[PDB]
């Protein structure tokens, strides 16, 4: 039972990637752009869920390599870390292709990740938290959009806006966006509902969702799948912790006064 | 541990610049390099192609001693004895003899000997199929014709009875 | 028993030619090559395992005695020192043949070489760590490839690429290029079930490249068939050292723990 | 069909030029500048189709080469990356005349620009997007004009204008400037025809450009170029991946609301 429940707090600890119609119309409205290489940038709030949906539309695209030609890599997705030059944006684009960089002057890596880039035949260049990078690569991100072709998502949020207005050429080029939604409703029910039926993955008590419960998790979460996830987790692996099966109401009273 | 060398036995009848080809060739030196080891100079140079306008003398010997780690005695008994002639060119083989024991004899260089006398061949002054005369045993890598490709123990069959 | 034992870690500390899908569609690259005598450089990062491909192509065509002729030989296979100039190519390329030329100078050298290419009619010239050659030597590489017809391979790292892009006569005929792959996929669970037995040769636990196994591979080899070769051949004589029947899951979480 | 729709999308994917007025007063102003070796600077808004028309001026008057003599290249067309320094300058205007680039140092190789560009006989040299090369360059490029005579022209948004505002010499010698209009009202309805009529290339729907659609694009577009082009193939590839062989005003009006 000890190994047992070490098994089921290390998978607690494990954040899990739940389908659901946010992700859906994300990666819908992503294989829609990348069909036509239409350069969008799709933006929302802090701790919605955006970077997850991205990674899923991500890794669904799984490159096929042949014998012995490149990987055809359709979909690229970098976050580039704060300040990022451009040198550093080029190394995270040719590493990503897996193709170790060499010592030399930025024009050196500008003309190896083209050329990786042409090769690979990579059709989505996606640039979560675009609001991180300097404003002397988007030219950059502008001229590999232009000569090559290829649809740019800049993820980030709201501040990305803000970030790219100030800028004549990247506001214009890139206007198509998808705002992610707060999910409040009843499909927030739904998701709160699957999340116990899939990503608690705990014995069926009949917990069902019930309406303190629900109302507990809305003053709480706010309609954050992040906040959402956080809360779930504490909550079993605290139950977990004292020998609770299940989840009761004191801990989500404990969880919820601990964040607000 | 002592100071060592990559040490080769010497064969017996083995001309001294074959014996000094293969210590050079097992020790990857060169022969202006084994002269300045041993402290002869250039001298070494020479003796892989048989000038032996002044015959190696004692001392000479004595420091190649030294070195290759053979005694001197044993080092003049690849020379030919006092008196004897040898042809420093063409240098002569014959294939029996060395696919026998793979080495180079300083006898086959006398001026008085043409015929093997445990073979009863004409022993040979040239390649028998292309005619290519052979290197100083020095530089007898292996066994083949340079030119040919054709290895030294197959000429055995070429070459006269 | 011992005896037996120290046979058996004898076998795994030495390397072993291993047969995968890559190195077959290498060689039938390389095929390719020979019959058009077009130049190539088969790329790819290090430890992809582009040597032992390219040791096994020259084994598979082994030089032949000729009887009228001396023999000739299919294919070159030379390895030249860091920073080493044409001459000592020129002397590697001989010794690799049966031929030998010492004294003598440069043009000498060069002019030998080439009379021993046309005499043995070498079809390729697998060069290994192409990029440990001096930039001039390449000129007299590409001089060979353009007089003698002689397909020239250039083996080595992405550090070729760059050394190859900084001149450009050299890369003036180098159109082509193979890049190697990194296995990832569902490649890797062939490649572990399959060096599971064929190379370890020991009474395998049923591992059949399980969960745990395969994803505490995949965090130490990441698809480098190399890192999993030597990874797998250590563990293995760890556990056949201290008298255990077959590998556990200690031992590769110890081997991998020294190597991340 | 299927394979039809495949042609029709690939057309529709690529771009064409359509001809027009404001395209033909640059040929003419070029024409006369080349002719009178001025150096001018032309200025224009965001997606309003400088790009495109330099291109067509480069395009139009080919270079005519003789036979065993360097091609006499009269124009000469760059788009320098951001903040390009005068190294990177020299090698794209080297790279432009077929003349492979020497390693060297920024003497020789402003050497080596210098005598090919004399070589070739330049008449004319543009330079697009030329609000992003330093201003360490622009003093090579006044060089240039001065010894060599050869009218430079710089394209950029407004913010070329402001760019060399900041410096004496070139706002002085660069003092020719022919700003890009908004080629909206009557005009931009002749666009919008011929545009349906040629860059469509589809089946005569009898739609004739109504007045309805007119006032969507004006509400849309507004009149930029790029926009226009956008939206219009948009709109188009979206009525043929349904299905429908002409254009509908649902389609149009989805993509209207997808960019404002
Ligand atoms: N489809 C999903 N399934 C399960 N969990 C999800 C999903 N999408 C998001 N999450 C949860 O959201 C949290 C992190 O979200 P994510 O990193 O994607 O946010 P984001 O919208 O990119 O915003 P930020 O910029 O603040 O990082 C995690 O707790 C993760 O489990
Ligand atoms: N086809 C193969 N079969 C078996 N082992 C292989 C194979 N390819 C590579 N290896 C293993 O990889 C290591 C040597 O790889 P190899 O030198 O061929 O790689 P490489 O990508 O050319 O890299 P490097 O240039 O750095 O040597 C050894 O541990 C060897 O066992
Ligand atoms: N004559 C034309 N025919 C067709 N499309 C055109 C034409 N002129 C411009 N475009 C469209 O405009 C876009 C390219 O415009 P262009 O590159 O000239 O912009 P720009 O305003 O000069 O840009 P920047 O802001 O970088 O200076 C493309 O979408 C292209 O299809
Ligand atoms: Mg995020
Ligand atoms: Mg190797
Ligand atoms: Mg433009
Ligand atoms: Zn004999
Ligand atoms: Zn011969």
Redesign the interface.
């Known amino acids: 039972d000890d190994e047992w429940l070490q098994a089921e707090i290390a998978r607690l600890k494990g954040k899990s990637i739940v389908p659901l119609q946010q992700v859906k119309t994300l990666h819908d409205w992503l294989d829609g752009k990348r069909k036509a290489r239409k350069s969008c940038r799709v933006v929302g709030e802090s701790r919605t869920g955006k970077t997850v949906a991205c990674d899923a539309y991500r890794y669904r695209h799984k490159p096929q390599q042949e014998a012995g030609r490149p990987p055809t890599v359709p979909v690229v997705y970098i976050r580039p870390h704060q300040k990022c030059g451009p040198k550093d944006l080029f190394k995270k684009i040719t590493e990503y292709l897996k193709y170790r960089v060499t010592k030399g002057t930025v024009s050196d890596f500008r003309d190896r990740t083209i050329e990786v880039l042409k090769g690979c035949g990579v059709e989505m260049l996606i640039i979560d938290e675009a609001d991180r990078l300097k404003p002397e690569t988007f030219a950059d991100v502008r001229d590999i959009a232009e000569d090559l072709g290829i649809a740019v998502v800049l993820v980030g949020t709201d501040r990305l806006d803000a970030v790219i207005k100030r800028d004549e050429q990247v506001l214009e080029r890139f206007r198509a966006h998808l705002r992610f939604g707060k999910l409040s409703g009843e499909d927030f029910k739904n998701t709160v509902e699957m999340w116990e039926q899939m990503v608690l993955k705990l014995p069926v008590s009949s917990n069902l969702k019930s309406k303190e419960m629900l109302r507990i998790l809305t003053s709480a979460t706010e309609g954050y799948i992040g906040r959402l996830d956080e809360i779930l987790r504490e909550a079993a692996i605290r139950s977990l912790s004292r020998g609770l099966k299940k989840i009761d109401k004191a801990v989500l009273q404990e969880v919820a006064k601990e964040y607000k | 541990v002592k100071p060592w060398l990559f040490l080769i036995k010497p064969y017996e009848g083995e001309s001294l610049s074959h014996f000094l080809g293969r210590f050079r060739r097992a020790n990857h030196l060169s022969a202006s390099g084994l002269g300045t080891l041993a402290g002869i100079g250039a001298i070494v140079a020479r003796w892989e192609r048989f000038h032996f306008n002044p015959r190696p003398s004692q001392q000479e010997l004595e420091a190649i001693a030294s070195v290759v780690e053979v005694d001197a005695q044993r080092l003049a008994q690849m020379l030919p004895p006092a008196g004897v002639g040898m042809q420093h060119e063409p240098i002569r083989l014959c294939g029996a003899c060395y696919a026998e024991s793979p080495c180079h004899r300083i006898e086959w260089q006398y001026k008085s000997v043409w015929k093997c006398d445990r073979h009863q061949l004409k022993i040979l002054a040239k390649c028998p199929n292309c005619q290519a005369p052979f290197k100083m045993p020095a ?1 007898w ?1 292996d066994g ?1 014709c ?1 030119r ?2 054709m290895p030294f123990a197959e000429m055995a069959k070429l070459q006269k009875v």
Do not use: F, G, Y
Request: glycine letters at 0%; charged letters at 35%.
């Open positions: 530089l890598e083949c340079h040919c490709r």
